[PDB]
Design a protein around this ligand. Structure first.
Ligand SMILES: Nc1nc2c(ncn2[C@@H]2O[C@H](COP(=O)(O)OP(=O)(O)OP(=O)(O)O)[C@@H](O)[C@H]2O)c(=O)[nH]1
Ligand SMILES: Nc1nc2c(ncn2[C@@H]2O[C@H](COP(=O)(O)OP(=O)(O)OP(=O)(O)O)[C@@H](O)[C@H]2O)c(=O)[nH]1
Ligand SMILES: Nc1nc2c(ncn2[C@@H]2O[C@H](COP(=O)(O)OP(=O)(O)O)[C@@H](O)[C@H]2O)c(=O)[nH]1
Ligand SMILES: [Mg+2]
Ligand SMILES: [Mg+2]
Lengths: 430, 439, 51, 206, 202, 432
C-alpha cells in the first residue's frame, strides 16, 4: 500500500516538482485533464501511492507546493499538467525571504508554517498506511534552505518512525549565482544532518557537465536539467509501484546503504544516456548499463569518486533481464577495481529488479552510492564560509533578526566535525 | 490418508512455492481452476492427491499450503494471475510493512502482529487432516522476514505440536555473490533459532544451481524461474513415495530416523541427476548405472560445498521410473569400491534406498526433457562445516567496528544477542570436527 | 507563452489561419470556442489572408 | 515464443515429436556448443529458454527489435508471461457469466409484477387504515400508478436469452478477496454495503 | 528390448471405462467397477468404487499390469476394448457398460482402427443389407414397422435392440450405440425415427 | 397447536422484526400480500383467516410515528393487522422516566388489549418473544412496564427477550448508561431468558466472515433473524431431536437470578468463498466455539462455562455431532465449571437454513446455532457500573430524569442490585 505525499519548496523546488509530476503522469497515462487513458491494467495497479481519487473519476496528486512569493506558483500552475494540482494545497507568503536564511528560518517561516503544517497533516492523516515523505529544494536560497529545514524539524517530531527523503541542490563553486551561498548552505546542513533520513546531492554544474558532453546539446534549458533529475527520482520508487523479481522499498535502501547514522549523504547517476546521433549505434545489454553506472562523468555531483572509496552502493534495474547476468556483473566490477572499495565490509553492492521499464526504453539504471569522496563538497564550502565569517561579511543582516553570531560557530564546528569523522572511515582498516 | 502441510515465507518462499504447485497440479491432472478437466466425467479413482490436495466434497480441490509475507506486491500478483481460483482466499496471508532486510524488525516488532493469524489458520488445516505426516517450510534466509517470521513460527510450532516432524529447505547466501549487503547478520542469527527447532535442513545455495543450469541445461542467461523448477523437481522426487506405489516405500518419518546421527547435526546438502536438455538427452542411454555416478559427482553438487574435503556420514537416495533393484545394488557396490569417496569410520553401512514406479513428469514450457529414470539424493557430510567458517569470517569483519548495529538495537533486540549467536556457531562448528575424527 | 502542437492538423504547430471565430479549436487537450475577435485582427485578417 | 507454438497439436498427435521432443526436423537449431553469430543473442539479451530454443527464435524471425517498445508488450511482468497454463499438449471457467445472469434474472423478475394500470385489488388503492401521514384534502383520493411499459420488460428478457450462449461476454473477470489495488473508484462513490465480491462488479462495470 | 518409441508418443492417452462384473456369485451382481487402460505399454487397471453406507471395503481391485486373453493367447489391445464387449481378466469377466467422454472423443478422432465408431461406416453397414429384400422402398417400411410397434416417434434402447434382433440383422453392440447417440437431439437417449428415415433416404 | 407471540418495541425492535418476518414469510412460502400461491406447519407463527391471507402473530409498539410509517408503506403493508401497529405521537427522547412514568403508562392498556385478544385465539400458547434495544428510552421504559404488567397478567408463561446492550466503547447516545441499568434492574426479576446482542461484535463478525467492510443496519438484522429462525425451527419442522421453548430455562438457568446468556452462529460465509470448503459438521462447531465469533462483545476465555446449548439443522448425523462434543471436551483451553459434569443440550432438525434471494449469506446444507451461559459475562456489568459511577458521582443529567416522577434515590437501589448480581456471579464461579 505504502503511499507517500510530496513536499516541495522554493522556486528551485517548484520547477523540479513541475517536471517530476509530468513524468509520473505520462508514466501512468494521465492526461492534462486528470483522466485515465491507458491500455494495460498494471498502470492502475498501484496508483494510490501518488494519486488521490475524487468524485467524477479524476485523479489529483498529493503534493504540497510551498514558497514565500506568489510569483512562482502563478507560473507553475499554468504549465502543462498544472491544472491537476488542487488549488487549496498552494501556500505562499506575501513578503519573501530574499535569499536570507534568517528571514526564511526565524521571522517569516515561523509564522507561515502554521498553515502549511495543517494541510500536510490532513494529507498524512487521510491515508491508512503512510510510508514516508520526500523533499525537493535548494540550499542556496533563504526561503528554500530556511523554512524548508524548519519544516523538516517540525515534521520529524510528529512522525519519528516514518521514512524521509530529501533532494538537496547544494551550490557548486564554479557556477555560483549568489554571494550568500556559503552562509545559508552551511547552516542548513547543520539542521539537515540531524533530521533527514536520506539526502541526495544534486549539483547544477554536474548536470551541465553531463548534458553538454553525453547528450551533446548546444543549447539546453532548465527543462532539460529538470528532465534528468525527474528520471532518477522516479527510479528510486519505481519498483514500489510495479511488481518485479526483487522488491525494494525506501526502507530497504536506507538500511542496506548507510553503515552509520550520521553518514546519509549520497550521489546518484542515471543510465543509459545517449545522444540522438549515437542513439542508434549502441547496444542495450547489461555490460553497457553497468559500465556507465559507475563511470565518473555520469554522477549527478561534481565530486569524483576516484578521489575516495565507496562505502556501500546500490543499483535499481528496470525491465526484464536475466538475474545471473545482473549478479555476475556486480561481482565483476567489485573485483577489478578493489582499490575503490572499502575492505572491511565485503559484498557492499545491492541489486534490485523491476519488470516495468520507463516509457520509450527497454532497460534502465538507477544508481545511489555512498562514497567518501563527497567530503570535498563540505571542505570547499567550509573554506568559503570561513572566508566570509572571518571578516564578518554580510553579517549585520543575519544577526539583526533575533539570532546572535554564536549559532554560526557550532554549525561550523558540527560541519567541521562531520568532515573529520566522515574522512576517518576512508583510511580505516580492519 | 496421509497429508503434509507446506509453509512458505518470504519472497523466495513464495516464488519457490509457486513453481512447486504448478508441477503438482499437472502431476495429478489438476486444471488451474480446480476441476480435473471439464472432460473426465468418471472420477472417483486412485485417490493420491490427498497428500497435497483436499476435496471440497463436490468438485474443486484446495491445496494444503499457506503463503506468508509482509509486502503485498508478490502476493497480490498471485491473486491476479491464472491461478486465482485455486487457493483458498484467506490462507495467503499478507502484511502491511516489509521487514526491509532487518532481522529485528521481522522478529520482535512486526512479526508479532501477524504470527497469530497463521497459527489460527494452521490449526484449521491440521484439524482437517487425520494422518498428517509433517510440515515443510521454505524460506530465503538472507531476507528480513524470511528469517524473521521463520524464526518465530518454528519456535511457536515447536511447543504447539511437540514431536511432530518439521522439514526445512533453507536458501543460504552464496559465498561470494550476494543480493544485499547486511546478509551475514540475519543469516547468522537465524541459525541459532532454527538449530534447536528444526528436524532436517537442506542447503539450496543459488550459485550452485547457476552452475548446473549453465553446464548441463546449457542456459547462458537464466533467471530465478529456471532455478525454482529444479527445486520443485526435488520436492517431487522427495515425497513421490507417499502417494505413488513403488517397490520400496520411504516415508517422511524415515529421514529423522535414518540420516541424523546426533540431534545437533541435522544439516545436509542434496544432488539431482540426470539434468540434461532434450536435444542431447536422446544421444545416450541414461542407464541407471551412470545416473547414480552423476549424483555423487561433486561438480553437480547443489550446494557450494565439496564433499572431498570431508567425510560422509550417511547417504539417502530415492529412485523413480523403471529401475531394477539388482541394478541399484550393483551400482552401490561400485560406489563403495571407489577410493576417492570415503565414509566415516563408525558407519559401516550408510545407504538408504527407495524405489518408485512413476517416472518424472515433463512440464510444457519447461527446460528438462522427459526420461525414464531419475535419482534424488540427500547426503550428510562433514564438508558442511566450511560454510559456517566463511560466514564467521565475514560476520566478524564488520562486527568488529559495530557496523549496522544501530539498525538492530533500536528495534528492541538487545546487544547481547550477537555474542550468544557467535558462540553457538563456534560450538556448532566444534561438534563437526569432533565427530569427523576417527577412533 | 509557448509554441503548442495542434492535434487537429497532423500534430503541427499553430498557424494564424487556424484560429477562426465561430469555430471550435483545441489547445493542449482542451476545447475552446471563439466568440469574437479584436477588430485590430479583423483589419489584419482582411489585409493579409485575402488571396 | 517457440515454447508455446512449436510441438503444435497437429504434430504431437500421430507425429514424430512428443512433449520433450527432438524438434530438429521441424525447424532449425545449432546443437548447443556452436561458435558463430546468431543475429539475436547478444543484441536482445534473450534470457532463459535454453540455447536450442534461442536459435530457433532468431532463425525463424518471430523476434523483436528496437529501443522503443510499443506500449502493449512493454507492460508484461515475468510472472504471467511464463506461467500461462499448459498450452500445446492436448486440444477456462464458465463462471462470471452465470453470476451476472442470475443477478439480472432477479431484477427482471422483480420488475415483472409492479401492478401496472389498475391491477391492484380494491384494497391498497387507498393507504392503510391508520396511516398517520398528511392526506391532503385537495388531491385525488385513489393513488395513481404508472409502472414500467411493456417493451422495457421485453428489453430485459432479450438480453437474458442473448447472454446465455450468445454474443455477450463475461464482464471483466476480477481478483478474489485481498487484492489491494485501486479497484476504480470504490472510495469516490461510497458503495458501502455491497458485498466486496459484488462490490468489485459494480465499481468495475461503471 | 522394450518399445521406448511407443512409450514416448502414447504415454498421455489413457482410456477409462465403467463396467460391471459377470460371475457365478450373487454376492457381487450389483457392485460397479471403473476400468482404466494405459496404452503406453498395454496396461490395465481395475478400480472398485464403494457407495456410502454400503458396508463394502472399496479400493483398488487389480493393480495395473499386462496380461493376455486366454482363448487366442494374444495380448489385449485398444481394438478389443470397445464398449459393450466382455473382457476376461484372468478369472474375472467384466462387461463394459459406459465409457468416459474423453474416451469417446479419442475413438471417434482416430478412424480406420475403430471402424464401429465411425458413423458413415455404420450407416453403410445397415443400408447395404437391403440387397436381399425385393425393393429398397419396402425395406424402409418393413424396418420402421418392426422397430416401432405403435409408431410413437421416439423409442428406447431396449425397444431399438429387440426390433433389430427380431428382424434378424446382426449389429454389434458398439454400432447400435453409435447410431443411438448421434440421433439424440436433446441428449436424453431416445432415438428420433424421423431423422433416421431421412438419413436412410427421403 | 403450538403458538408464540412476538413483541417489537422501539426502533431497533421494529427494524429487527421486519427482517424476522420477511425471513419467516420466505421460509413458509407466503406471498407478501399474505395470500398463499395455491400450494398447518405455519400455525405456530401465523393465523388463518378461514380462507385467504394469513396474519402474523406480532404486535408493533412505538411512540414515534415515522418508523412505523415505513412499515405501512413498504411491501408488507397488507400483511399485518392495521390496529396491531400501535404508534404514539411524542417520543421518549431517550428519557427512561418519560417511557416508564409519564407517556408509556397510558398506552400499556391498549398494548394489553391487543395482547389479550391475540392470546384468547391462541390455545396452546408456549411463550412470548420480546425484542427491544436497551440503549433507548421507550425501548427500556415501555419494555420494563410491559414486562412488569405481563408477568402478573400471565403467570408462569415463558418470556424470551433478545435485548441489545450498548457496546463497550462504540456508542451513539450519551445517557445510555443511565437507562441501561434501570431497565436491567426491572427485567432481572421479570424475564426468564435474556440474550445479549450488542452491536460491536456483529460488526467484527460481518467484517471477518461476510467480507463486508462498510456494513449497515440491514445486514445486522438479517443475522439476528437467522438466529431466531434457527432457534425456533424445532417448533414447526420435524427432526431427529425436537426441543420446545419450555425446555430451555430448565437447562441453561442454574439459578433464578442467572438468566443472562450470549449466542453464536455458524457458518456465515459469503458465496465468493463458500464453495472452497465442504462445511463439515466437525468444523462448523469449532467456528461456533471460536471466542472471536461470539455475537456479544465478551471473551469466554476469561471465565468458566456453565452450560452449552446446540442447534444443528440441515443433514447432520447424530453420531457426527457427538464426536465434535467429545473433541471439544478433550480440548484444554475450554473448561467447564466444577459442579457441571454434563454440560451440553443438543438439537437436530431436518429443514436446511433458508437463503434470502439477493441477500448476503450463501446457501449451505449445514448450520449450527449456539447458546451458552458462562461466568465471563460479568465484564459488561462491571464496565457499565464503572461508566455509571463516573457519571452519577457529580449528579450529571439528573434533572432530565427527576422532573418526570423519578425519585432521587432510585439510582442507588439499581446500583445495589447490580452489585448484588456481581456478587452472585463471583460466588457462583468459586470452586467448592
Ligand atoms: N533460489 C532463490 N532465491 C531467492 C528467490 N527469491 C529471492 N531469493 C533470495 O532471497 C534473498 C532476499 O530476500 P527476498 O526473497 O528477495 O525477500 P524476503 O525473503 O521476503 O526478505 P525481504 O526483502 O526483507 O522482505 C536474496 O538474497 C535471494 O538469494 C528465488 O526465487 N530463488
Ligand atoms: N442491532 C440494531 N440496533 C439498533 C438499530 N437501530 C437502533 N439500534 C440501537 O438502538 C439504540 C437507540 O434506540 P433506538 O433504536 O434509536 O430507539 P429506542 O430504543 O426506541 O429509543 P428512542 O429513540 O429514545 O425512542 C442505539 O444505541 C442502537 O444501538 C438497528 O437497526 N439494529
Ligand atoms: N536543477 C535546477 N536548479 C535550479 C532551477 N532553478 C534554480 N535552480 C538552482 O537554485 C539555486 C538558487 O535557488 P533560489 O532561487 O535561491 O531558490 P529559493 O530558495 O526558492 O529562492 C541556483 O544555484 C540554481 O542552480 C531549476 O529549474 N532546476
Ligand atoms: Mg522480501
Ligand atoms: Mg426510539
Amino acid at each position: 500500500m505504502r503511499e507517500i505525499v510530496h513536499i516541495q519548496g522554493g522556486q528551485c523546488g517548484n520547477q523540479i516538482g513541475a517536471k517530476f509530476w509530468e513524468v509520473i503522469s505520462d508514466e501512468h497515462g494521465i492526461d492534462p485533464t486528470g483522466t485515465y487513458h491507458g491500455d494495460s491494467d498494471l498502470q492502475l495497479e498501484r496508483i494510490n501511492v501518488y494519486y488521490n481519487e475524487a468524485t467524477g473519476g479524476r485523479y489529483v496528486p498529493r503534493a504540497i507546493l510551498m514558497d514565500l512569493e506568489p510569483g512562482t506558483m502563478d507560473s507553475v500552475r499554468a504549465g502543462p499538467f498544472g491544472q491537476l494540482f488542487r488549488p487549496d494545497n498552494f501556500v505562499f507568503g506575501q513578503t519573501g525571504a530574499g535569499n536570507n536564511w534568517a528571514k526564511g528560518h526565524y521571522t517569516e517561516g515561523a509564522e507561515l508554517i502554521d498553515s502549511v503544517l495543517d494541510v500536510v497533516r490532513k494529507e498524512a492523516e487521510g491515508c491508512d498506511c503512510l510510508q514516508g515523505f520526500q523533499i525537493t529544494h535548494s540550499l542556496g536560497g533563504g526561503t528554500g534552505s530556511g523554512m524548508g529545514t524548519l519544516l523538516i524539524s517540525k515534521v520529524r517530531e510528529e512522525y519519528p518512525d516514518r521514512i524521509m527523503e530529501t533532494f538537496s541542490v547544494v551550490p557548486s563553486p564554479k557556477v555560483s549565482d549568489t554571494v550568500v551561498e556559503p552562509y545559508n548552505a552551511t547552516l542548513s546542513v547543520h539542521q539537515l544532518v540531524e533530521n533527514a533520513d536520506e539526502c541526495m546531492v544534486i549539483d547544477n554544474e554536474a548536470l551541465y557537465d553531463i548534458c553538454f558532453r553525453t547528450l551533446k546539446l548546444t543549447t539546453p534549458t532548465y527543462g532539460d536539467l529538470n528532465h534528468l533529475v525527474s528520471a532518477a527520482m522516479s527510479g528510486v520508487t519505481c519498483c514500489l509501484r510495479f511488481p518485479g523479481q526483487l522488491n525494494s522499498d525506501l526502507r530497504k535502501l536506507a538500511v542496506n546503504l548507510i553503515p552509520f547514522p550520521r553518514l546519509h549523504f549520497f550521489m546518484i547517476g542515471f543510465a543509459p544516456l545517449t545522444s540522438r546521433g549515437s542513439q542508434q549505434y549502441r547496444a542495450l545489454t547489461v555490460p553497457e548499463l553497468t559500465q556507465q553506472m559507475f563511470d565518473a562523468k555520469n554522477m549527478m555531483c561534481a565530486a569524483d569518486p576516484r578521489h575516495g572509496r565507496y562505502l556501500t552502493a546500490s543499483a535499481l534495474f528496470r525491465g526484464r533481464m536475466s538475474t545471473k547476468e545482473v549478479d555476475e556483473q556486480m561481482l565483476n566490477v567489485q573485483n577489478k577495481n578493489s582499490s575503490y572499495f572499502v575492505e572491511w565490509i565485503p559484498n557492499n553492492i545491492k541489486s534490485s529488479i523491476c519488470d516495468i521499464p520507463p516509457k520509450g526504453l527497454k532497460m534502465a539504471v538507477t544508481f545511489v552510492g555512498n562514497s567518501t569522496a563527497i567530503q570535498e563538497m563540505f571542505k570547499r564550502v567550509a573554506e568559503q564560509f570561513t572566508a566570509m565569517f572571518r571578516r564578518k561579511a554580510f553579517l549585520h543582516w543575519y544577526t539583526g533578526e533575533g539570532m546572535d553570531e554564536m549559532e554560526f560557530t557550532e554549525a561550523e564546528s558540527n560541519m567541521n566535525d562531520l568532515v573529520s569523522e566522515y574522512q576517518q572511515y576512508q583510511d580505516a582498516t580492519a | 490418508m496421509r497429508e503434509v502441510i507446506s509453509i512458505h515465507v518470504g519472497q523466495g518462499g513464495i516464488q519457490v512455492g509457486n513453481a512447486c504447485w504448478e508441477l503438482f497440479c499437472l502431476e495429478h491432472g489438476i486444471q488451474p481452476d480446480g476441476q480435473m478437466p471439464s472432460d473426465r466425467t468418471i472420477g472417483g479413482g486412485d485417490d493420491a492427491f490427498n497428500t497435497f490436495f483436499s476435496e471440497t466434497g463436490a468438485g474443486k480441490h484446495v491445496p494444503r499450503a499457506v503463503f506468508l509475507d509482509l509486502e503485498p506486491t508478490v502476493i497480490d500478483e498471485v491473486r491476479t494471475g491464472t491461478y486465482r481460483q485455486l487457493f483458498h482466499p484467506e490462507q495467503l496471508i499478507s502484511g502491511k510493512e516489509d521487514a526491509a532486510n532487518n532481522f529485528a524488525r521481522g522478529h520482535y516488532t512486526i512479526g508479532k502482529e501477524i504470527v497469530d493469524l497463521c497459527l489460527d489458520r494452521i490449526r484449521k488445516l491440521a484439524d482437517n487432516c487425520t494422518g498428517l505426516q509433517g510440515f515443510l517450510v521454505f524460506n530465503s534466509v538472507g531476507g528480513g522476514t524470511g528469517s524473521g517470521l521463520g524464526s518465530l513460527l518454528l519456535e511457536r510450532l515447536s511447543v504447539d505440536y511437540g514431536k511432530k516432524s518439521k522439514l526445512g529447505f533453507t536458501i543460504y547466501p552464496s559465498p561470494q555473490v550476494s543480493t544485499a549487503v547486511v546478509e551475514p547478520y540475519n543469516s547468522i542469527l537465524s541459525t541459532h533459532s532454527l538449530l534447536e527447532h528444526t528436524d532436517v535442513a537442506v542447503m539450496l545455495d543459488n550459485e550452485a544451481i547457476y552452475d548446473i543450469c549453465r553446464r548441463n541445461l546449457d542456459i547462458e542467461r537464466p533467471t530465478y524461474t529456471n532455478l525454482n523448477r529444479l527445486i520443485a523437481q526435488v520436492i517431487s522426487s522427495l515425497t513421490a513415495s507417499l502417494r505413488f506405489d513403488g517397490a520400496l516405500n520411504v516415508d517422511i518419518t524415515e529421514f529423522q530416523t535414518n540420516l541424523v546421527p546426533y540431534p545437533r547435526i541435522h544439516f545436509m546438502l542434496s544432488s539431482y541427476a540426470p539434468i540434461i536438455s532434450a536435444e542431447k538427452a536422446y544421444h545416450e542411454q541414461l542407464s541407471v548405472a551412470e545416473i547414480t555416478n552423476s549424483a555423487f559427482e561433486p561438480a553437480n553438487m547443489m550446494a557450494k560445498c565439496d564433499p572431498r574435503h570431508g567425510k560422509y556420514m550417511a547417504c539417502s537416495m530415492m529412485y523413480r521410473g523403471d529401475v531394477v533393484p539388482k541394478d541399484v545394488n550393483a551400482s552401490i557396490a561400485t560406489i563403495k569400491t571407489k577410493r576417492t569417496i570415503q565414509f566415516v569410520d563408525w558407519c559401516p553401512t550408510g545407504f538408504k534406498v527407495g524405489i518408485n514406479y512413476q517416472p518424472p513428469t515433463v512440464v510444457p514450457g519447461g527446460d528438462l526433457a522427459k526420461v525414464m529414470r531419475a535419482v534424488c539424493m540427500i547426503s550428510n557430510s562433514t564438508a558442511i562445516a566450511e560454510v559456517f567458517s566463511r560466514l564467521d569470517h565475514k560476520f566478524d569483519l564488520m562486527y568488529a567496528k559495530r557496523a549496522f548495529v544501530h539498525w538492530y538495537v533500536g528495534e528492541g533486540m538487545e546487544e547481547g544477542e550477537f555474542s550468544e549467536a557467535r558462540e553457538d556457531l563456534a560450538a556448532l562448528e566444534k561438534d563437526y570436527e569432533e565427530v569427523g575424527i576417527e577412533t | 507563452k509557448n509554441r503548442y502542437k495542434n492535434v487537429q492538423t497532423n500534430n503541427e504547430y499553430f498557424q494564424p489561419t487556424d484560429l477562426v471565430v465561430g469555430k471550435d479549436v483545441i489547445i493542449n487537450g482542451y476545447s475552446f470556442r471563439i466568440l469574437e475577435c479584436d477588430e485590430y485582427t479583423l483589419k489584419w485578417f482582411a489585409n493579409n489572408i485575402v488571396q | 515464443n517457440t515454447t508455446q507454438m512449436i510441438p503444435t497439436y497437429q504434430d504431437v498427435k500421430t507425429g514424430t515429436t512428443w512433449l520433450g521432443g527432438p524438434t530438429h526436423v521441424l525447424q532449425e537449431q545449432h546443437i548447443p556448443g556452436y561458435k558463430g553469430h546468431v543475429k539475436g543473442v547478444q543484441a536482445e539479451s534473450l534470457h532463459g529458454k535454453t540455447f536450442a530454443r534461442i536459435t530457433a527464435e532468431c532463425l525463424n524471425n518471430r523476434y523483436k527489435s528496437g529501443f522503443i517498445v510499443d506500449d502493449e508488450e512493454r507492460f508484461k511482468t515475468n510472472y504471467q508471461l511464463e506461467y500461462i497454463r499448459p498450452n500445446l499438449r492436448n486440444n477456462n471457467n464458465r463462471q462470471r457469466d452465470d453470476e451476472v445472469e442470475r443477478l439480472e434474472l432477479i431484477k427482471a423478475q422483480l420488475n415483472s409484477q409492479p401492478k401496472t394500470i389498475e391491477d391492484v385489488p380494491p384494497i391498497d388503492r387507498v393507504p392503510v387504515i391508520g396511516y398517520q401521514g398528511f392526506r391532503p384534502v385537495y388531491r385525488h383520493p385513489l393513488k395513481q400508478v404508472k409502472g414500467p411499459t411493456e417493451d422495457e420488460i421485453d428489453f430485459q428478457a432479450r438480453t437474458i436469452l442473448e447472454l446465455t450462449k450468445g454474443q455477450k461476454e463475461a464482464p471483466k473477470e476480477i481478483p478474489i478477496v485481498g487484492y489491494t489495488g485501486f479497484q476504480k473508484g470504490i472510495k469516490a462513490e461510497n458503495m458501502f454495503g455491497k458485498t466486496f465480491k459484488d462490490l468489485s462488479n459494480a465499481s468495475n462495470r461503471i | 528390448r522394450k518399445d521406448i518409441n511407443k512409450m514416448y508418443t502414447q504415454d498421455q492417452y489413457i482410456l477409462r471405462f465403467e463396467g460391471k462384473l459377470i460371475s457365478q456369485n450373487k454376492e457381487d451382481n450389483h457392485r460397479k467397477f471403473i476400468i482404466s487402460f494405459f496404452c503406453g505399454d498395454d496396461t490395465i487397471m481395475v478400480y472398485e468404487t464403494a457407495d456410502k453406507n454400503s458396508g463394502i471395503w472399496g479400493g483398488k481391485f487389480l493393480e495395473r499390469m499386462n496380461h493376455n486373453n486366454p482363448i487366442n493367447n494374444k495380448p489385449y489391445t485398444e481394438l478389443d476394448f470397445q464398449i459393450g464387449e466382455i473382457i476376461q481378466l484372468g478369472v474375472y469377466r467384466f462387461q463394459l457398460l459406459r465409457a468416459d467422454e474423453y474416451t469417446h472423443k479419442y475413438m471417434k478422432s482416430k478412424p480406420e482402427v475403430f471402424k464401429e465408431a465411425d458413423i458413415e461406416y455404420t450407416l453403410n453397414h445397415l443400408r447395404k443389407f437391403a440387397t436381399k429384400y425385393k425393393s429398397y422402398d419396402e425395406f424402409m417400411v418393413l424396418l420402421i414397422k418392426n422397430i416401432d410397434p405403435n409408431r410413437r416417434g421416439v423409442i428406447d434402447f431396449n425397444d431399438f435392440v429387440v426390433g433389430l434382433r427380431r428382424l434378424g440383422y446382426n449389429l454389434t453392440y458398439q454400432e447400435i450405440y453409435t447410431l443411438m447417440r448421434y440421433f439424440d437431439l436433446d441428449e436424453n437417449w431416445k432415438l428420433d425415427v424421423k431423422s433416421l428415415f431421412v438419413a436412410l433416404g427421403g
